[PDB]
PDB file of C-alpha atoms in Angstrom:
ATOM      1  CA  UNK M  35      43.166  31.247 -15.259  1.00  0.00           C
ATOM      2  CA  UNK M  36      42.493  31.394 -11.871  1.00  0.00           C
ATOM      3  CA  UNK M  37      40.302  29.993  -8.905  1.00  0.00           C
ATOM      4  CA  UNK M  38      36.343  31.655  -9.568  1.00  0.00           C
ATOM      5  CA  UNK M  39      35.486  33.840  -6.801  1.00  0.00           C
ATOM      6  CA  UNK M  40      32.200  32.253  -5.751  1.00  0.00           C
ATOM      7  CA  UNK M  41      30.007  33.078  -2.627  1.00  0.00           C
ATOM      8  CA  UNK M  42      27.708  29.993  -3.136  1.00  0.00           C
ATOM      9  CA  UNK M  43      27.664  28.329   0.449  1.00  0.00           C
ATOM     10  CA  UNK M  44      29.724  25.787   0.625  1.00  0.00           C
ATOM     11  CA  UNK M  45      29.005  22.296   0.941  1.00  0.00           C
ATOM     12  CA  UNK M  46      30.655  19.809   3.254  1.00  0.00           C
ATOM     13  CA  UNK M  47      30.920  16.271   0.554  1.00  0.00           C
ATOM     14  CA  UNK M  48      33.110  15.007   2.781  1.00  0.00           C
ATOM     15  CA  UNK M  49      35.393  15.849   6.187  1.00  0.00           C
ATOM     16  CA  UNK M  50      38.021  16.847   3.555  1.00  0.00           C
ATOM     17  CA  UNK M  51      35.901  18.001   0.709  1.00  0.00           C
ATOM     18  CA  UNK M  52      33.225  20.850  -0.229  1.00  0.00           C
ATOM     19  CA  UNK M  53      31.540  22.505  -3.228  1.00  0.00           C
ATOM     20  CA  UNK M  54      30.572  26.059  -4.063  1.00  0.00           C
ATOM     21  CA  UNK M  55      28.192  25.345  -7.019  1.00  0.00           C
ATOM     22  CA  UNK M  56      28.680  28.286  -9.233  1.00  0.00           C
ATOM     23  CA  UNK M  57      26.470  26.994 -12.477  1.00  0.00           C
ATOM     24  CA  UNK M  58      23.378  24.441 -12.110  1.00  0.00           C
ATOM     25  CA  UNK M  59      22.994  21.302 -14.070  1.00  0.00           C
ATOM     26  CA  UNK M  60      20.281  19.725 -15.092  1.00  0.00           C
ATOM     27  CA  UNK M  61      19.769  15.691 -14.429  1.00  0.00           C
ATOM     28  CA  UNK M  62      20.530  13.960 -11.415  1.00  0.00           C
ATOM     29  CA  UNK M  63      23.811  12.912  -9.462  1.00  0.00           C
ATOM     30  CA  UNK M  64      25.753  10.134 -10.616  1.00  0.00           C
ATOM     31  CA  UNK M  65      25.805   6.701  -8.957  1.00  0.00           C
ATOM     32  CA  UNK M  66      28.332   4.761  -7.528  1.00  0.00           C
ATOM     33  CA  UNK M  67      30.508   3.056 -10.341  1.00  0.00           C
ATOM     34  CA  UNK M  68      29.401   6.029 -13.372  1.00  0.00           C
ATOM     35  CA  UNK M  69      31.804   6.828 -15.620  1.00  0.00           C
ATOM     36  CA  UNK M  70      32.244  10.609 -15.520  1.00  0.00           C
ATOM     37  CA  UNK M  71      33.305  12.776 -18.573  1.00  0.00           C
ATOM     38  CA  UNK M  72      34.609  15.780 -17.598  1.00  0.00           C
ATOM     39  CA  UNK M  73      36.838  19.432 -17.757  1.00  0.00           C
ATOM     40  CA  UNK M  74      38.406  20.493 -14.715  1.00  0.00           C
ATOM     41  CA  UNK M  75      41.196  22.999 -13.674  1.00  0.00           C
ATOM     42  CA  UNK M  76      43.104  22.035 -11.177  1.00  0.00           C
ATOM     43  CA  UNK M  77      44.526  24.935  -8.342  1.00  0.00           C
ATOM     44  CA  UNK M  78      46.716  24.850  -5.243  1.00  0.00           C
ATOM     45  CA  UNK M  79      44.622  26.461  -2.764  1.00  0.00           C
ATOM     46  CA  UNK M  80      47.394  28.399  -1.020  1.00  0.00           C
ATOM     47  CA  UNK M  81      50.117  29.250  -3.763  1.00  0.00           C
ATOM     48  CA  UNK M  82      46.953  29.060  -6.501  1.00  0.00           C
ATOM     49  CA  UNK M  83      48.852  27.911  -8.915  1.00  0.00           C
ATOM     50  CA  UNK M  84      47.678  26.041 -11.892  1.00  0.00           C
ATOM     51  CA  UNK M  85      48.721  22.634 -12.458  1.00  0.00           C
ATOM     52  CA  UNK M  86      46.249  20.810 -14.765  1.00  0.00           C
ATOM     53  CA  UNK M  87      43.598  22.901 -16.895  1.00  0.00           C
ATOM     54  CA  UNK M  88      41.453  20.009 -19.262  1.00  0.00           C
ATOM     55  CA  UNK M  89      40.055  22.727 -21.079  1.00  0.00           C
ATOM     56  CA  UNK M  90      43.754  24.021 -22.687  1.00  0.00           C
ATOM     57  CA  UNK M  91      44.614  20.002 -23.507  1.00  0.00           C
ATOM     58  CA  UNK M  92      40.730  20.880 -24.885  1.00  0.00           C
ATOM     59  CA  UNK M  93      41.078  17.016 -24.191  1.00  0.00           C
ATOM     60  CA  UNK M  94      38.505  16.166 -21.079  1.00  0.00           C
ATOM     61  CA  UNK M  95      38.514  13.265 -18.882  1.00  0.00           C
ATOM     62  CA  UNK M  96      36.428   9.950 -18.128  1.00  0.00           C
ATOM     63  CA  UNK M  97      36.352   9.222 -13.974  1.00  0.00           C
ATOM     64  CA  UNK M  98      35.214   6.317 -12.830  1.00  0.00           C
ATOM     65  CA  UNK M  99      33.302   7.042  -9.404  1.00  0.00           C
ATOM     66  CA  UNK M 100      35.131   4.223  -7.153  1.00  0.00           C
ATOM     67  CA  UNK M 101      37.415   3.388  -9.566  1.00  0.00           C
ATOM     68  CA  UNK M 102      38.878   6.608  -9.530  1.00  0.00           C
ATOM     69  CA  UNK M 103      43.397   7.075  -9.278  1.00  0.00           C
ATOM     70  CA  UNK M 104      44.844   7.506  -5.981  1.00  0.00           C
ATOM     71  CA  UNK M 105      45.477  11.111  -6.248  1.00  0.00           C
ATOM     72  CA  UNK M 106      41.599  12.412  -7.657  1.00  0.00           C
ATOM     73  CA  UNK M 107      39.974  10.771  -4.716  1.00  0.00           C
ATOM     74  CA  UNK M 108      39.209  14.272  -3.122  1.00  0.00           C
ATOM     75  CA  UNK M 109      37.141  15.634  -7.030  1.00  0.00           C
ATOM     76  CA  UNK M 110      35.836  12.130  -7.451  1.00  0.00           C
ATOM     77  CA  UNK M 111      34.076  12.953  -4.075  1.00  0.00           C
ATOM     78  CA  UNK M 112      32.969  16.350  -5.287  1.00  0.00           C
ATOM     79  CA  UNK M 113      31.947  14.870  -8.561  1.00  0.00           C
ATOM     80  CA  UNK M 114      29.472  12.345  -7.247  1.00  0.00           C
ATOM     81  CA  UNK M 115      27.841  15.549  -5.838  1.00  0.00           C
ATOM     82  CA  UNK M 116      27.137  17.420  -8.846  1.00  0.00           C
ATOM     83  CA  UNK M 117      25.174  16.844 -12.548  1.00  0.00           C
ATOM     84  CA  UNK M 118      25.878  17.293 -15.917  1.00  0.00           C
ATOM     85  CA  UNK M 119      26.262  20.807 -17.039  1.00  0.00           C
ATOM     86  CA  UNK M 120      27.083  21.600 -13.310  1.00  0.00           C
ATOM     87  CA  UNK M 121      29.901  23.577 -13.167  1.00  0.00           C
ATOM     88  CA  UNK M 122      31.451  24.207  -9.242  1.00  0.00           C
ATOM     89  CA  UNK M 123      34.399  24.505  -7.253  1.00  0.00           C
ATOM     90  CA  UNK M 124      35.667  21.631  -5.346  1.00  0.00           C
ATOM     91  CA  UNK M 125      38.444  22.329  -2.002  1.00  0.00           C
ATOM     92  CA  UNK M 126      40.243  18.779  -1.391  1.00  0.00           C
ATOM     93  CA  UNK M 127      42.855  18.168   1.170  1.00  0.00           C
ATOM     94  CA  UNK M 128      46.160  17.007   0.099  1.00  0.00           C
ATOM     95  CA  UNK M 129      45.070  13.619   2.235  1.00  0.00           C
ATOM     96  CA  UNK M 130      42.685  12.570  -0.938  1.00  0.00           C
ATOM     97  CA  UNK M 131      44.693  14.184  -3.382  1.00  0.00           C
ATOM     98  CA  UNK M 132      48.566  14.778  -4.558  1.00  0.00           C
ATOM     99  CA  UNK M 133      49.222  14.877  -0.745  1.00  0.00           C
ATOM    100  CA  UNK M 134      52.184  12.696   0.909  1.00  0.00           C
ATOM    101  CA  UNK M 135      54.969  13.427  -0.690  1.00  0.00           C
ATOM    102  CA  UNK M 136      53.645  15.803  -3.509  1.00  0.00           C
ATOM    103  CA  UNK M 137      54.159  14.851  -6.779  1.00  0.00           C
ATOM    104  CA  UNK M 138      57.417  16.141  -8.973  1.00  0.00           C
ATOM    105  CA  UNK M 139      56.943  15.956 -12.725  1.00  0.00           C
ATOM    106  CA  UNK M 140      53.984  15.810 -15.057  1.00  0.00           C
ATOM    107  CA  UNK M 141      51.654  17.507 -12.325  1.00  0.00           C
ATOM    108  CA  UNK M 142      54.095  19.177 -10.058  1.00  0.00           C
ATOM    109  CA  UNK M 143      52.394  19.402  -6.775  1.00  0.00           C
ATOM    110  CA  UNK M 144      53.840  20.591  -3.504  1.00  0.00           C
ATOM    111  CA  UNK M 145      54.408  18.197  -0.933  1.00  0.00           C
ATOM    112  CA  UNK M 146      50.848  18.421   1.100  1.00  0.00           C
ATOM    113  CA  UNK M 147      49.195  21.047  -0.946  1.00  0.00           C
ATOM    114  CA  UNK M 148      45.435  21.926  -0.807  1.00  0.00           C
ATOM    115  CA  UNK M 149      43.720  21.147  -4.383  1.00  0.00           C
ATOM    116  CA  UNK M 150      40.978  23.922  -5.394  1.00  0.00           C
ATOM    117  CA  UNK M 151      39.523  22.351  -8.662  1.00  0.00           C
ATOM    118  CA  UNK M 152      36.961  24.217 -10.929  1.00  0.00           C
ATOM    119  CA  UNK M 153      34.717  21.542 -12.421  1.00  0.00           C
ATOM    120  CA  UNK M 154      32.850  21.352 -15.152  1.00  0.00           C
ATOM    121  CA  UNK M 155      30.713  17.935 -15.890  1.00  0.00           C
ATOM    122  CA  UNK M 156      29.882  16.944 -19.139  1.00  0.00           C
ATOM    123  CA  UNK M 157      27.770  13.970 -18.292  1.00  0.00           C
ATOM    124  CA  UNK M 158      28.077  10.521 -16.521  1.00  0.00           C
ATOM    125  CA  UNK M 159      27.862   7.011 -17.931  1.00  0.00           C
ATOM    126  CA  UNK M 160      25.879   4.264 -15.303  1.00  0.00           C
ATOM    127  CA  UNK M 161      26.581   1.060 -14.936  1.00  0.00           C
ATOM    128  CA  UNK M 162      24.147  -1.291 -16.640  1.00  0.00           C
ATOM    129  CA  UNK M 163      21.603  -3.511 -15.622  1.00  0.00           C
ATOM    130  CA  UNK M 164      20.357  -7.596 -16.294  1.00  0.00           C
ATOM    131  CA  UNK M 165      19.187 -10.254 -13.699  1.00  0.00           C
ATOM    132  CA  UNK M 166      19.726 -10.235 -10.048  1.00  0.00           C
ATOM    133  CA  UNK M 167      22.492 -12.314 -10.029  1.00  0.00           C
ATOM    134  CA  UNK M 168      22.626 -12.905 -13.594  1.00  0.00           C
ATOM    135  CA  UNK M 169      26.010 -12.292 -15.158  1.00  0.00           C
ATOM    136  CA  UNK M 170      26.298  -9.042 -12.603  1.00  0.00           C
ATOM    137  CA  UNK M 171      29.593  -8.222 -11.682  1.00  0.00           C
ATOM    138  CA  UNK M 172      30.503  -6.300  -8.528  1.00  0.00           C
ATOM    139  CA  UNK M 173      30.426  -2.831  -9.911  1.00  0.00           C
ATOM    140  CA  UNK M 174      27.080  -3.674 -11.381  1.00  0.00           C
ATOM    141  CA  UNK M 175      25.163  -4.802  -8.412  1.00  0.00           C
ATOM    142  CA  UNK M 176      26.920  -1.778  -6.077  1.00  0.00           C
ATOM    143  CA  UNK M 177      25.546   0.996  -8.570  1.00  0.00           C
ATOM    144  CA  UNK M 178      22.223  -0.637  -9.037  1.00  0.00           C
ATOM    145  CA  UNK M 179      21.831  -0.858  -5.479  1.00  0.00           C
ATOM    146  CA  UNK M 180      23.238   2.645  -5.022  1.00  0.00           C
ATOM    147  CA  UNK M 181      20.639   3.754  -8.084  1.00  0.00           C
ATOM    148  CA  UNK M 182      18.058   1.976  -6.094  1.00  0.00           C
ATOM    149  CA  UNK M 183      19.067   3.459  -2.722  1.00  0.00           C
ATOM    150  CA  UNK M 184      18.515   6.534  -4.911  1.00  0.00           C
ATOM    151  CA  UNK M 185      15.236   5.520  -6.423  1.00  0.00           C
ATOM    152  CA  UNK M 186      13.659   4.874  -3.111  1.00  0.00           C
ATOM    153  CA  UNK M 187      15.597   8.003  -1.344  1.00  0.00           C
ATOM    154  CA  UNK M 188      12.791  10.090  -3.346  1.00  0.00           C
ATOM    155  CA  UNK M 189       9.823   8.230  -1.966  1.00  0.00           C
ATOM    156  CA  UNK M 190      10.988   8.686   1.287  1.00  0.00           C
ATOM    157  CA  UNK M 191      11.689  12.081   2.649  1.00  0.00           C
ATOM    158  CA  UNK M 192       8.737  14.146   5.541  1.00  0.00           C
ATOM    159  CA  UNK M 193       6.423  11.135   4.760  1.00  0.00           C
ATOM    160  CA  UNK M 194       7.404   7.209   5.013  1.00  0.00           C
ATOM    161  CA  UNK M 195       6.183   5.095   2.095  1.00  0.00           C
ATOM    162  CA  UNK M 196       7.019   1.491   2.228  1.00  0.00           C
ATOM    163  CA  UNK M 197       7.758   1.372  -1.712  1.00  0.00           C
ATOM    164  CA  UNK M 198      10.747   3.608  -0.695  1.00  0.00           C
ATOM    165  CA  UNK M 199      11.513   0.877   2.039  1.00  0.00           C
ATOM    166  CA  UNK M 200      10.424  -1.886  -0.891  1.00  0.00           C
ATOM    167  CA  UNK M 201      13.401   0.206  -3.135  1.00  0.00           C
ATOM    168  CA  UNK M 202      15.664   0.053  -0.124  1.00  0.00           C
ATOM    169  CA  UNK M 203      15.046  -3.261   0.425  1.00  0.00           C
ATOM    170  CA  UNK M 204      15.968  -4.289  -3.028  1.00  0.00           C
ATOM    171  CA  UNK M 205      19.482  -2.118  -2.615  1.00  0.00           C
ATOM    172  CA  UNK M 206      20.076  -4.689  -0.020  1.00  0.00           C
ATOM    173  CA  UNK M 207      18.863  -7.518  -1.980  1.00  0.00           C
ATOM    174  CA  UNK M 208      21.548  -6.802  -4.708  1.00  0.00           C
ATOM    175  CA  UNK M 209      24.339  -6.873  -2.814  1.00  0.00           C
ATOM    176  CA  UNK M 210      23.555  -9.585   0.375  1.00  0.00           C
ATOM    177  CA  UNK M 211      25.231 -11.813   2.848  1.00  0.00           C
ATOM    178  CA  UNK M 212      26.524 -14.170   0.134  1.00  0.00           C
ATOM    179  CA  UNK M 213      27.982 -11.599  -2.057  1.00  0.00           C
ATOM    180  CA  UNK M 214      28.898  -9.068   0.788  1.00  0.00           C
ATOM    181  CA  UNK M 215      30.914 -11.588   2.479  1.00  0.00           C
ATOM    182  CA  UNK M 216      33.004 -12.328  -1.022  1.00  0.00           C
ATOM    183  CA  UNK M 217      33.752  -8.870  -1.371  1.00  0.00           C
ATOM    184  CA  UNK M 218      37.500  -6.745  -0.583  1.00  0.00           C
ATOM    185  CA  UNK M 219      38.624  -3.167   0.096  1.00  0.00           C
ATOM    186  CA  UNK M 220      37.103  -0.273  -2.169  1.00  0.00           C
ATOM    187  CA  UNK M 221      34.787  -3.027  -3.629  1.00  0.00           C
ATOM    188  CA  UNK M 222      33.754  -3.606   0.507  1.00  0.00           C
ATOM    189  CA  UNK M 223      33.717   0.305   1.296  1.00  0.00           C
ATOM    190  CA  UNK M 224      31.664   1.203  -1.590  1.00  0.00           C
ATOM    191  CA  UNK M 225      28.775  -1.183  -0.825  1.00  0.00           C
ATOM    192  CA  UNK M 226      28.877  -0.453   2.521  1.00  0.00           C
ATOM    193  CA  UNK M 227      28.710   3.250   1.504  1.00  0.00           C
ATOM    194  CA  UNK M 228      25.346   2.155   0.184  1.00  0.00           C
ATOM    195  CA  UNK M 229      24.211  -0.943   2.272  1.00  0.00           C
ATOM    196  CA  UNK M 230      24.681   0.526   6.001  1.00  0.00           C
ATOM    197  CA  UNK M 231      22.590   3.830   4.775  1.00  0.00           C
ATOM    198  CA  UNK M 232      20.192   2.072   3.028  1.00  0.00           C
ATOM    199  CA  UNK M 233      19.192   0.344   6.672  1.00  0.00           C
ATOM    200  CA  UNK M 234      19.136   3.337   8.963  1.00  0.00           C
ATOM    201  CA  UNK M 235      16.883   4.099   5.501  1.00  0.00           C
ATOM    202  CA  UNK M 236      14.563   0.917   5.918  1.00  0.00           C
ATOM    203  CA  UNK M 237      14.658   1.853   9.966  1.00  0.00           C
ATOM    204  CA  UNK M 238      13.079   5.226  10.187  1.00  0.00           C
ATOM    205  CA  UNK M 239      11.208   3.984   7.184  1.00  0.00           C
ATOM    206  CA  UNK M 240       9.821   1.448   9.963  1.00  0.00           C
ATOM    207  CA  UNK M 241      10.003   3.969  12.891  1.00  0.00           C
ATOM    208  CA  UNK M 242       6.992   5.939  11.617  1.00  0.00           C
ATOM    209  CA  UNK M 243       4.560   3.402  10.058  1.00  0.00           C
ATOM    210  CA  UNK M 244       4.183   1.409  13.396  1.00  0.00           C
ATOM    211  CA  UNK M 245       7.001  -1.114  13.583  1.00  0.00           C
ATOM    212  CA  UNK M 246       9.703  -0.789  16.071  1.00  0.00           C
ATOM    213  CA  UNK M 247      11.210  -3.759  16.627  1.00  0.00           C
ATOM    214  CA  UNK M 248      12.032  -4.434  13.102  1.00  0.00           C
ATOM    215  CA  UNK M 249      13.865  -1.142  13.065  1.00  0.00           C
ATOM    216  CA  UNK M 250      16.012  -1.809  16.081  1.00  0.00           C
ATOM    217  CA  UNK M 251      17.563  -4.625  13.973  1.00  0.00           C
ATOM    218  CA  UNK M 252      18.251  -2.601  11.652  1.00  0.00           C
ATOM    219  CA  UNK M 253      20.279  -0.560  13.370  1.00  0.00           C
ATOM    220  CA  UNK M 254      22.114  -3.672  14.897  1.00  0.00           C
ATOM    221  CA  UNK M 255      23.126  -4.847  11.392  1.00  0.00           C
ATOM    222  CA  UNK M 256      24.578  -2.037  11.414  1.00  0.00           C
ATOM    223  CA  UNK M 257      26.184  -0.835  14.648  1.00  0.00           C
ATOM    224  CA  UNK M 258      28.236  -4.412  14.482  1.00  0.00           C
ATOM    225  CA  UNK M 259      30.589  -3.358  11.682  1.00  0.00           C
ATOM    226  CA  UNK M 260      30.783   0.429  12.898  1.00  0.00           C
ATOM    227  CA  UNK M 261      29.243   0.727  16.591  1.00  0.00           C
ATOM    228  CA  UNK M 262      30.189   3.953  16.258  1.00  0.00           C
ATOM    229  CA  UNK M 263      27.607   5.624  13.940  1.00  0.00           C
ATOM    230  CA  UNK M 264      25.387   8.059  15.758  1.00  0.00           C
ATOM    231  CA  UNK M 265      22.949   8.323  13.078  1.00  0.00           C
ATOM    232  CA  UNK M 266      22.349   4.881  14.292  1.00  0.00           C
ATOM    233  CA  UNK M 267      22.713   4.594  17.785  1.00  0.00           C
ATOM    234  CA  UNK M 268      19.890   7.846  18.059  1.00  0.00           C
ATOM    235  CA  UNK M 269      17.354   6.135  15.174  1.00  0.00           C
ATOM    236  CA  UNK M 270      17.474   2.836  17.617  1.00  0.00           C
ATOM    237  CA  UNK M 271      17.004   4.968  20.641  1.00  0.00           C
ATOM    238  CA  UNK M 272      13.725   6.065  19.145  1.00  0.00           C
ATOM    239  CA  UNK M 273      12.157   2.905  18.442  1.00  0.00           C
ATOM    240  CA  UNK M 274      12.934   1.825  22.001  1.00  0.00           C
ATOM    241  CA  UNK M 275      11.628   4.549  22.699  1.00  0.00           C
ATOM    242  CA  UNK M 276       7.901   4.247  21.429  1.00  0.00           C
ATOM    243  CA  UNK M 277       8.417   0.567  22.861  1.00  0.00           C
ATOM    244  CA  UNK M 278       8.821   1.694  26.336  1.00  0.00           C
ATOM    245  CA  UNK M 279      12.258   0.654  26.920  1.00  0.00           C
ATOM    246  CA  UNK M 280      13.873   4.030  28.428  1.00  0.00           C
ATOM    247  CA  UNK M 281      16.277   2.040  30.363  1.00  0.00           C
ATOM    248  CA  UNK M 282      18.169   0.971  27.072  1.00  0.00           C
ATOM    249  CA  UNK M 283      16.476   3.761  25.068  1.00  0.00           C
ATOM    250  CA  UNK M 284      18.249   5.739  26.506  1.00  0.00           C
ATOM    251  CA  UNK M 285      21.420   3.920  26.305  1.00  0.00           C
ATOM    252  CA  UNK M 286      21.727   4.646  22.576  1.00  0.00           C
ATOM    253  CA  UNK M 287      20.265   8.196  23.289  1.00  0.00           C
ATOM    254  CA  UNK M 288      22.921   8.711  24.750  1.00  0.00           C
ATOM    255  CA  UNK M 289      26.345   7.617  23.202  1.00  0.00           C
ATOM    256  CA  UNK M 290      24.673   8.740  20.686  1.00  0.00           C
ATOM    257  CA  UNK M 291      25.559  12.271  21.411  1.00  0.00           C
ATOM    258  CA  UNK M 292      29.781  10.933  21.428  1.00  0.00           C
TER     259      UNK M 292
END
């Protein structure tokens, strides 16, 4: 076949990643660490030509968001965006797909060719659940964490409920110092994914029910592995700034705008 014309706007995933949703599924996203069933075609955006089509092998795939192969970083990206019976349209830069040298047999790709992929979910398997610590490995405690990032990303959204801060709280909980510190690569990047969120989460979630200082913190946990975040360096202005402090309050105002 080839690429669906769709005029659905087009989401932004990722710097080199976006979706045109052209069907709607019903559900919710998947969370980090789900194992994804799923039909795809797969498109180069320029010479749109065909390469990979799981609906002619009528054989579809399993992903594993995190776990995912080199090459499908880009779709694992769009993935994690859409539900099951979502069907879309994913545009993924050569960087996070077949995209160095191209690859030459079994999927010929181009050298640095722009993947268009036409995705259809089937549904998503979650990682599974026991005791805090108990017999959880990694990939366990991330998704849980990123479930429960979820969980309290609904009771938090124009108002501030604390049980959403009590749901971010327990992301964090999960996955602390101890285990964070015995953690490596895309094991370390996905929890991070979910752990340095989940505070600028617990932060406004402080900003607006009358604690400021314990929302500046927050954003310090956070602005020491990544000073450069924005998202943070503004949130932190803003309790300083209900704290009278505009001679640092404006500080992260400021290079907050970089």
């Amino acid at each position: 076949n080839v690429p669906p014309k769709v005029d659905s706007e087009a989401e932004v995933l990722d710097e080199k990643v976006s979706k045109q949703i052209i069907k709607e599924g019903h559900g919710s996203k998947p969370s980090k660490y789900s194992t994804c069933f799923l039909h795809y075609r797969a498109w180069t955006k320029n010479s749109q030509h065909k390469f990979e089509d799981t609906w002619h092998e009528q054989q579809p795939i399993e992903l594993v968001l995190g776990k995912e192969k080199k090459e499908l970083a880009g779709l694992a990206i769009g993935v994690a965006s859409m539900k099951s019976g979502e069907r879309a349209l994913v545009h993924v830069g050569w960087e996070l797909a077949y995209g160095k040298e191209g690859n030459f047999s079994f999927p010929n790709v181009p050298p640095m060719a722009d993947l268009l992929y036409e995705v259809e979910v089937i549904g998503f398997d979650e990682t599974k659940e026991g005791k805090a610590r108990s017999d959880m490995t990694v990939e366990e405690r991330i998704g849980a964490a990123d479930r429960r990032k979820m969980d309290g990303n609904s009771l938090f959204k124009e108002e501030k409920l604390e049980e959403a801060m009590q749901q971010y709280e327990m992301a964090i909980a999960y996955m602390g110092d101890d285990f964070m510190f015995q953690l490596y690569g895309k094991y370390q990047d996905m929890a991070l994914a979910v752990k340095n969120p989940c505070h600028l989460n617990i932060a406004a979630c402080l900003i607006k029910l009358k604690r400021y200082d314990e929302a500046i913190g927050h954003c310090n946990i956070v602005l020491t592995e990544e000073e450069k975040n924005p998202k943070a360096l503004f949130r932190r202005g803003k309790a300083k700034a209900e704290l009278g402090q505009m001679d640092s309050a404006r500080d992260d105002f400021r290079k907050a705008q970089k």
